[PDB]
Design a protein around this nucleic acid. Sequence first.
DNA 1: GGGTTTCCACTTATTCAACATTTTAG
DNA 2: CCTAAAATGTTGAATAAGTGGAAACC
Length: 295
Amino acid sequence: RESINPWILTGFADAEGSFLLRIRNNNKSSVGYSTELGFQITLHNKDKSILENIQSTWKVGVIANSGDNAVSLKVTRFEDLKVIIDHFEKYPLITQKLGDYKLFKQAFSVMENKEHLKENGIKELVRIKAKLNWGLTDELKKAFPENISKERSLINKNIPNFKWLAGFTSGEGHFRVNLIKSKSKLGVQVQLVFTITQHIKDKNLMNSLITYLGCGYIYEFNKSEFSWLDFRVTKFSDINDKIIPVFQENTLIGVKLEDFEDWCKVAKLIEEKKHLTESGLDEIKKIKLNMNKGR
DNA sequence: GGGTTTCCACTTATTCAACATTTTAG
DNA sequence: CCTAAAATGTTGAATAAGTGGAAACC
Ligand SMILES: [Ca+2]
Ligand SMILES: [Ca+2]
Ligand SMILES: [Ca+2]
Ligand code: NA
C-alpha cells in the first residue's frame, strides 16, 4: 500500500518501461485499422510488488501474468494515459526512452482529437510508429506507400538527482561478491563489484556516471553483432565511501534491495578485515550463496 | 446497435544482469 | 610474496517490445 517517490519511479521507468502503439488491421473499423496507445512494465514474478506499488502511486494500469515467470503492468485506457503524461512532464525521462515518450505524446494528441478514426490520423500514427521502438513491420510499411523517416534526434541529458539513480539502479544495477581464486595466503580474494549495464545508444549517460558518482570505469562488450556497456566500480574505497552511501540515502526498490543489504554486510566485514579470516570468508561465502540468482 | 475501446493470454528477440576466471598494479 | 584492482570473456533469461482474441462499452 506504499507509494514510490516520483523520481525513483521515473528512473525505474527509464530502466524497465516501454511505450506501445498498436496499429491493427481491423475489418470492423471505418478506416480499416484500430489503435491502442500505452505504457507498460514487465518484470519477473518475484518483483510483482513493485508493479502493485506503481499502480497504487498512479491509480491506473492493470496487472496480468506475462508467461509463467513474469508479470506486467499495462496502461492503455485512454483517459488514464493523462496520468502517464502528467507524471513524465513533471519528472522527465533521461535515456533514449525520452524519445519514445515524445512519440507517445504525439500519438496521444492524434487520438485525443479523434483523428485516428480518419484516414489522415491513421497515416500520422503510422509515421509516428515508424520512429518508435522497432518501427513498422514490412506489412504495415507496404500498406502505407509513402516515404516515411525512421530517424529521430538522440537524447542527451544528465542524471537529474540521486532518486532517479536509485530507481534506475533498481532496474539495471547489479551488486555482487566476486570470489577470485588467488595466490593470497587464504587463496580466495573477495572483490565487491557494482555494475550497471546498458546498450551503447546511451553511452553518453553511461559515461557520465563516472563523473556523477566520482568513481568507476566503462567497458564495452560484443556478442556477435550486439554491443553493450558496463559501468563498474571495483575499488573498495569507492564502494564503501561513494556507492553504498548513495543507496542508503536513496533506497532501492524490489528484491534488488535485499541484495544491496547483503552486499553491505560483506562491505562491513571487509572494512573490519574479517575477509582475511577463515570465519569471515565462510560467512561471506554464505551471504553470497543467498544473493542474486541464489536467493 | 456496431464501431471502438480495453483487457487478458501469450510470443519473440535480445539487452541486460549475472558470473567466474585471468591478468595487472602496487 | 600478499592483496587489491582491473580486464577478459561468456551466458541465457528477465526484460523490453509485440500480437491474437474477444468482451463489452458508448
Ligand atoms: Ca533498459
Ligand atoms: Ca532492465
Ligand atoms: Ca577480449
Ligand atoms: Na531489472
